[PDB]
Amino acid sequence: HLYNVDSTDLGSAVAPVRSKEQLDRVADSLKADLNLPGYGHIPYKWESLRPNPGA
Amino acid sequence: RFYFMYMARTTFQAVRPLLAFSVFGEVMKLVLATMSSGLFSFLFSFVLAFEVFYFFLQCYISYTFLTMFFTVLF
Ligand SMILES: CCCCCCCCCCCCCCCCCC(=O)OC[C@H](COP(=O)([O-])OCC(O)COP(=O)([O-])OC[C@@H](COC(=O)CCCCCCCCCCCCCCCCC)OC(=O)CCCCCCCCCCCCCCCCC)OC(=O)CCCCCCCCCCCCCCCCC
Ligand SMILES: CCCCCCCCCCCCCCCCCC(=O)OC[C@H](COP(=O)([O-])OCC[N+](C)(C)C)OC(=O)CCCCCCCCCCCCCCCCC
């Protein structure tokens, strides 16, 4: 009752391990929670045979 | 009814080149307005040239049919 928590488990005692899958998971969850129509839209792209000029 | 048939045929043969020059031109203009890159433009130049040749072909056809339709014996 002294702490602002819903349960007694405050999480792991070690940081996560770098993982492409976990990153994608977190990003998808954030996108779903935001629900913003306009993410990923590209109004102008440098004209090139390469799909992503530069990056 | 023969007069109506004849006038229909004559008008179609007379407007054929106008169509080839106007509506296909509008299509080409749409393509020009939408295209930006260089490869597609290189490929579309040949379509434009083909439209030139097709217009001349339609004009020849119309000339033939019109000299057939405006030929009188007497
Ligand atoms: C007469 C002189 C000679 C004329 C010919 C010279 C041109 C030769 C090239 C021809 C090839 C063209 C390609 C056609 C396919 C479609 C692609 C395309 O065209 O897009 C390119 C570009 C548009 O690209 P974009 O829209 O951004 O889209 C995709 C990107 O282009 C591309 O996508 P990206 O961004 O991802 O690519 C990035 C990267 C990709 O490329 C690279 O990464 C590297 C490329 C370099 C390769 C180097 C060679 C490799 C050598 C290996 C061997 C080494 C050892 C051996 C050699 C040792 C050397 C000693 O960089 C490039 O893109 C390089 C493109 C270079 C464009 C050409 C530059 C020349 C402009 C015209 C100069 C005119 C001079 C005056 C003419 C005078 C006439 C009176 O458009 C043009 O380049 C137009 C070319 C027009 C040529 C005109 C020729 C003259 C005709 C005169 C007509 C009269 C009216 C003209 C008005 C003025 C009248 C006075
Ligand atoms: C029994 C009779 C039979 C009759 C048959 C009739 C069928 C053929 C009718 C087609 C007539 C089409 C001509 C009008 C379209 C061109 C308008 C024009 O001149 O634009 C201004 C042109 C182009 O101008 P421009 O594009 O440089 O810039 C100004 C253009 N304006 C003003 C429109 C903005 O003026 C010129 O300088 C042209 C000079 C070059 C010569 C071009 C003429 C040849 C191309 C047309 C041939 C069509 C006849 C083919 C017949 C084949 C028969 C075998």
CA distance B39 to B52: 21
Residue among A44, A46, A47 with most chain B CBs within 10 A, to mutate:
A47
Q: From the CA of B38, how far away is ligand 1's center (Å)?
A: 10
Backbone angles phi, psi at B23, to 5 degrees: -80, -45
Q: Give me the resolution in angstroms, 1 decimal.
A: 2.8
Way the structure was solved: cryo-EM
What is the rounded CA–CA span in Å between residue B24 and residue A14? 69
Taking the C-alpha atoms of residue A45 and residue A38, their distance in angstroms, rounded to an integer, is 16
- Residue among B60, B57, B62, B32 at smallest CA distance from B47: B32
- Tell me, what DSSP letter sits at residue A37? T
- Scan residues 1-55 of A and list those with Cβ closer than 8 Å to B: 47, 49
